[PDB]
Amino acid sequence: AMATGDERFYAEHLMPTLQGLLDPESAHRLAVRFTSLGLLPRARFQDSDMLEVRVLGHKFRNPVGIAAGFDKHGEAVDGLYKMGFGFVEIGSVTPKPQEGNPRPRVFRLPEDQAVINRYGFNSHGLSVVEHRLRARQQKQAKLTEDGLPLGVNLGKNKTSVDAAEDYAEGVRVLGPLADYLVVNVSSPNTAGLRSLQGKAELRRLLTKVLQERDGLRRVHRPAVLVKIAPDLTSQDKEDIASVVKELGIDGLIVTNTTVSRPAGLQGALRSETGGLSGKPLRDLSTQTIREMYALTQGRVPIIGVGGVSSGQDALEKIRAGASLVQLYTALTFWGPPVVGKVKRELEALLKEQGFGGVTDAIGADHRR
Numbered sequence: 001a002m003a004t005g006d007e008r009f010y011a012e013h014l015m016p017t018l019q020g021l022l023d024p025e026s027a028h029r030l031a032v033r034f035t036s037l038g039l040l041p042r043a044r045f046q047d048s049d050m051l052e053v054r055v056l057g058h059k060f061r062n063p064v065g066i067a068a069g070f071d072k073h074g075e076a077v078d079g080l081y082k083m084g085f086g087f088v089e090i091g092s093v094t095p096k097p098q099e100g101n102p103r104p105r106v107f108r109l110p111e112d113q114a115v116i117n118r119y120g121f122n123s124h125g126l127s128v129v130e131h132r133l134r135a136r137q138q139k140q141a142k143l144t145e146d147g148l149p150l151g152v153n154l155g156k157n158k159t160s161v162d163a164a165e166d167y168a169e170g171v172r173v174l175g176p177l178a179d180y181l182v183v184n185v186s187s188p189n190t191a192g193l194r195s196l197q198g199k200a201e202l203r204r205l206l207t208k209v210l211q212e213r214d215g216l217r218r219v220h221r222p223a224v225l226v227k228i229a230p231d232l233t234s235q236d237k238e239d240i241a242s243v244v245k246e247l248g249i250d251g252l253i254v255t256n257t258t259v260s261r262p263a264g265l266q267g268a269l270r271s272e273t274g275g276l277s278g279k280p281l282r283d284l285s286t287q288t289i290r291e292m293y294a295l296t297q298g299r300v301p302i303i304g305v306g307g308v309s310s311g312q313d314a315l316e317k318i319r320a321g322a323s324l325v326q327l328y329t330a331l332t333f334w335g336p337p338v339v340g341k342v343k344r345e346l347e348a349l350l351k352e353q354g355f356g357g358v359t360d361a362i363g364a365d366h367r368r
């Protein structure tokens with residue numbers, strides 16, 4: 001098709017050529033610019049009824065979202081919907097602006113279809129992102145009503161003494177502009193951050209976040225999700241499940257990047273510090289989804305993320321317990337046509353496997 005035409009040209013020729021000419025962070029920045037300007041191939045794929053998902057108090061036209069980290073500062077939201085994503089997540093956003101780690105801080109592993117990053121929460125800060133989202137607040141309200149919700153992922157400043165107050169500030173400032181908020185406690189690139197996944201610290205943190213969210217006016221009151229690492233102990237996962245059910249957290253995002261280095265990585269840059277994304281993360285993420293779904297008795301919506309670059313990858317996460325999926329790293333290798341590719345392949349597999357739609361497949365592996 002013209003679809004598989006663009007998919008082949010981007011994957012085989014355009015993206016490898018452009019990535020060969022540019023430093024990885026330069027490629028990221030240009031991508032945000034092109035997306036914000038709508039300089040994108042046609043998204044030929046027409047979302048069908050069988051891809052619609054109702055979760056987190058919203059309609060999602062399709063279950064494929066852009067993961068946090070691509071649009072950290074909310075500059076490219078409308079262009080990301082134009083790419084065919086069913087939902088957009090921006091961030092992480094920190095309270096105050098901060099530069100993040102020194103460059104280079106992004107590394108390509110094309111032999112592994114992976115990336116390693118150590119951006120360190122480079123952020124324009126809440127004030128700048130607030131004003132950027134306010135400029136399109138009513139445009140977003142219409143997109144959300146039309147099944148295209150917006151998520152905002154909150155982080156904490158490097159030098160902050162009170163992590164919970166940083167997240168609370170994010171809820172107050174960006175909560176009113178979001179369909180869902182993400183308490184990102186799983187960056188591998190902020191010292192001490194992943195310790196906030198521990199039981200006593202998570203319960204205190206999430207209580208404060210939920211109190212702040214509950215204090216927002218009804219039309220401005222987002223869902224709250226916790227985004228977790230793929231590197232948790234069994235004890236950590238049990239504790240997170242316990243706290244999420246105790247406090248009525250609305251959902252989980254499973255998973256962030258890994259600080260592991262699976263056996264078999266080939267890229268020259270495999271021993272760089274940072275979080276590993278893409279294909280080597282895929283099954284570690286899927287198995288984290290599977291465990292979190294079971295520990296929460298299928299009662300807590302999961303957004304599955306890590307190494308999705310095909311319909312099969314998306315359906316494996318859905319059958320493991322994800323209601324929605326996200327991708328980022330595949331877009332660095334395949335370019336924008338990957339979104340229609342994943343959607344087309346997912347629709348075909350749902351039909352092949354006897355599912356009426358995405359909803360019927362959620363958690364299907366647990367019922368075998």
Ligand SMILES: CCn1c(CO)nn(-c2cc3c([C@@H](C)C(F)(F)F)nn(-c4ccccc4C)c(=O)c3cc2F)c1=O
Binds near residue numbers: 018034035
């Ligand atoms: C992890 C950091 N990181 C890297 C490095 O690891 N790459 N990367 C992306 C780059 C791109 C680029 C680059 C090559 C360009 F901008 F330099 F071309 N272009 N495009 C594109 C092509 C044709 C038309 C419209 C767009 C947006 C994309 O979609 C795209 C996505 C990405 F995630 C990205 O976020």
Ligand SMILES: Cc1cc2nc3c(=O)[nH]c(=O)nc-3n(C[C@H](O)[C@H](O)[C@H](O)COP(=O)(O)O)c2cc1C
Binds near residue numbers: 308
């Ligand atoms: C360059 C880069 C930056 C990221 N920054 C963030 C971030 O700010 N917040 C966050 O929650 N996740 C961040 N992530 C993690 C992604 O959202 C996602 O969880 C992870 O990359 C796995 O999905 P993927 O294999 O499809 O990329 C980042 C990932 C990459 C590759």
Ligand SMILES: O=C(O)c1cc(=O)[nH]c(=O)[nH]1
Binds near residue numbers: 120
């Ligand atoms: O800013 C980053 O370094 C970043 C944050 C996050 O949550 N995950 C990731 O892989 N990198």
Ligand SMILES: [Cl-]
Binds near residue numbers: 054056057058
């Ligand atoms: Cl719902």
Ligand SMILES: [Cl-]
Binds near residue numbers: 081082
């Ligand atoms: Cl659109």
Ligand SMILES: [Cl-]
Binds near residue numbers: 024106107108109
């Ligand atoms: Cl590189």
Ligand SMILES: [Cl-]
Binds near residue numbers: 176177220
């Ligand atoms: Cl408002």
Ligand SMILES: [Cl-]
Binds near residue numbers: 232233234235
């Ligand atoms: Cl363990």
Ligand SMILES: [Cl-]
Binds near residue numbers: 259260261262
């Ligand atoms: Cl390891």
Ligand SMILES: [Cl-]
Binds near residue numbers: 259272273275
């Ligand atoms: Cl590391």
